């Protein structure tokens, strides 16, 4: 039972001290582990830092975490890798960001989600709150093709009926001769938006110019434009769904400790095919039979599925869904499961775009009744999740037990004639609603 | 247990070559370094190259470059030195050493029992 | 490379009393916490048998009367009581820098 000589490499931001690092069971394998603290990295610190590790021991892992928000320590670090035969995990800060491409020698393995995973997550958010008719607005900002191409491929291959309206291509240099039109084409409700942090303040202050921004049009974007939470600008409105990653619950020693399990898991599988496990170079100056890549798509830890898979990343990643707030901060709404999605918000609430300059009164509550056949109520659909499309939904407030008073709003379908009546009227008057069943009692009685 | 075994003493004319075997009889041969020792008479150390079993991965010093060749065989759980051109200094005592995989220094734990070449 | 170099070459000490060893390194031999540095006792005949790893900890199965201490570049072992083992050569080997390298050596009497 040989052990491995993995040397972990953080950040100094990080409160984590190399006491704790060098102190930290359970793992198939024996794992001393060599610590370093560093600061700030430059092209040149990283490469002398590595070439001084790999010297006096025969390290045979890494793991890399960091602070910043560079996105070239990721490039430098499959770069480091490919010339060195040395198992890089990314962890935190600027190595966590996912390159696309990589060389097909490199063992650089990273922890985060890609540009498919998000827009699954968003699509999911948006037929949990049914939100069926939206658009799409994406500049040339590169990948924008493959965002395209997954949610058309998605779309076109699913039990809720979307309806896209529009695909929306901004290439000019918002000259408004252009873009202003291609703006005015849309009238939906949920619009998603693919362009980086910059660009997405012009897009925004545009379209509130517009008139796009207010207490229905509902925006979702990726982690893309959602970047560093402390940095929030001025043009961003109060209500703005974006999906990212999960730094709050998230610890660093627990990250450390995924990643030291990742590894010794892996080469504890390949020392029973093979009866010798990789190693670094002799040095890095001067002058690869069997990889780890079919090693690391089948591995289990503590019941948590850790696989990674065939292109480089994580099987089951834990995303984070987080709204802006009336404070100005991102607040955690709601995470990500293994597969399925779990919201705090049963009902979405509204917040007020900007200063709620225009208050809003056509959104009505409405109460109903049932008595047939005026009024009928229907249990959902578990096909799909979701009322068949000639009903609206509708809640109603069932006590769990009649010991206390808590309950929960379950959501039914309801059709009948009083039912088109109210869809005719929201029609021709243009208003919306909120229905729901009442509990109290019959019609009414003093 | 961890045993090694050597062959036994040489003595040729000068300039041919010899062959030293090290057997491992003690652990899974291709999991572990192989290092091999020079001692001269009583005034030092130094070191000649390495082999892992497993992967054929070979490492050698400078000095020792393009003179001693490393070669195993993971039937006969045997490592093979190839000594070449020998001269008046090559007399000396060579051991074979295997480490353990436990620790983060790279130490020599056990030893062979060492064969003697004469010119 | 590290070149070691041990004093005194050849000493002589009665026996009961206590015996010291320095090996001075030529450049820092310290790796990340843990110093970099081995002592060997080779019975004249026989293979070197190994006494101390990481310059502060002894090896399993031997005397306590054995040990080893320092730091940076300069080492030193001492051994007490002076018994009917300490006969043997010693060196001392680095683990910094490939190659490793060692010592003079050093007898006792």
């Known amino acids: 039972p040989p052990a491995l000589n993995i040397a972990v490499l953080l950040g100094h931001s990080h409160d984590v001290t190399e006491r704790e690092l060098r102190n930290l069971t359970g793992l198939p394998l024996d794992v001393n582990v060599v610590a370093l603290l560093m600061n700030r990295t430059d092209p040149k610190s990283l490469i002398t830092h590595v070439c001084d590790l790999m010297s006096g021991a025969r390290i045979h892992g890494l793991v890399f975490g960091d602070d910043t928000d560079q996105e070239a320590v990721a490039q430098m670090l499959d770069f480091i890798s490919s010339q060195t035969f040395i198992p890089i995990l990314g962890i935190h800060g600027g190595a966590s960001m996912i390159m696309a491409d990589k060389d097909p020698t490199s063992t650089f393995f990273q922890f985060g989600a890609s540009i498919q995973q998000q827009a699954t997550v968003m699509l999911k958010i948006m037929q949990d709150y049914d939100w069926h008719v939206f658009s799409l607005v994406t500049t040339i900002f590169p990948g924008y093709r493959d965002f395209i191409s997954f949610i058309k491929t998605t779309v076109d291959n699913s039990f809720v009926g979307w309806d896209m309206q529009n695909v929306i291509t901004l290439d000019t240099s918002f000259e408004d001769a252009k873009t202003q039109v291609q703006l005015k084409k849309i009238h939906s409700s949920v619009i998603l938006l693919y362009c980086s942090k910059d660009e997405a303040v012009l897009i925004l202050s545009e379209a509130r110019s517009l008139g796009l921004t207010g207490y229905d049009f509902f925006w979702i974007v990726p982690s893309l434009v959602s970047g560093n939470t402390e940095l929030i600008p001025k043009e961003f409105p109060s209500g703005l769904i974006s999906v990212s990653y999960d730094d709050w619950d998230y610890s660093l020693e627990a990250r450390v400790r995924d990643g030291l399990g990742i590894l010794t898991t892996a080469a504890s599988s390949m020392l029973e095919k093979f009866s010798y496990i990789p190693e670094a170079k002799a040095s890095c100056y001067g002058q690869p039979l069997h990889t780890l890549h079919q090693f690391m798509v089948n591995v289990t830890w503590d019941g948590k599925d850790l696989s990674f898979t065939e292109e480089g990343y994580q099987v089951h990643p834990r995303l984070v869904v987080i709204v802006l707030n009336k404070d100005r901060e991102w607040e955690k709404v709601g995470k990500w499961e293994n597969q399925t999605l779990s919201l705090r918000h049963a009902v979405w609430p509204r917040y007020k775009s900007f200063s709620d300059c225009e208050p809003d009164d056509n959104h009505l509550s409405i109460v109903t009744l049932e008595e047939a056949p005026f009024v009928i109520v229907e249990d959902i659909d578990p096909l799909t999740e979701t009322c068949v499309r000639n009903t609206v939904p509708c809640r109603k407030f069932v006590k769990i037990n009649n010991s206390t008073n808590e309950g929960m709003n379950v959501k039914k379908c309801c059709k009948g004639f009083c039912i088109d009546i109210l869809k005719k009227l929201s029609r021709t008057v243009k208003f919306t609603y909120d229905l729901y069943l009442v509990t109290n009692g019959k019609h009414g009685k003093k | 247990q961890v045993q090694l075994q050597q062959s036994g003493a040489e003595l040729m004319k000068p300039g041919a070559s010899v062959k030293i075997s090290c057997k491992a009889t003690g652990y899974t041969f291709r999991s572990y370094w192989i290092e091999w020792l020079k001692q001269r008479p009583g005034h030092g150390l130094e070191w000649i190259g390495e082999?892992?079993?497993?992967?054929?991965?070979?490492n050698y010093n400078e000095k020792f470059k393009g003179k001693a060749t490393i070669t195993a065989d993971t039937s006969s759980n045997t490592a093979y030195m190839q000594l070449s051109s020998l001269t008046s200094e090559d007399s000396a005592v060579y051991y074979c050493?295997?480490?353990?995989?436990?620790?983060?220094?790279?130490?020599?734990?056990?030893w062979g029992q060492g064969a003697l070449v004469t010119v | 490379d590290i070149v070691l170099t041990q004093s005194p070459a050849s000493l002589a000490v009665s026996l009961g009393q206590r015996a010291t060893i320095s090996c001075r390194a030529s450049e820092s031999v310290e790796y990340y916490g843990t110093t970099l540095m081995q002592w060997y006792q080779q019975k004249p005949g026989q293979p070197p048998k190994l006494l101390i790893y990481?310059?502060?900890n002894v090896d399993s199965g031997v005397p306590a009367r054995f040990s080893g201490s320092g730091s940076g570049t300069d080492f030193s072992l001492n051994i007490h009581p002076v018994e009917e083992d300490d006969i043997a050569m010693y060196f001392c080997?680095?683990?910094?820098?490939?190659?490793?390298?060692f010592g003079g050596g050093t007898k006792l009497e």
């Open positions: 080997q680095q683990s910094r820098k490939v190659p490793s390298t």
């Open positions: 050493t295997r480490s353990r995989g436990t620790m983060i220094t790279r130490e020599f734990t056990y």
């Open positions: 990481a310059a502060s």
């Open positions: 082999i892992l079993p497993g992967s054929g991965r070979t």
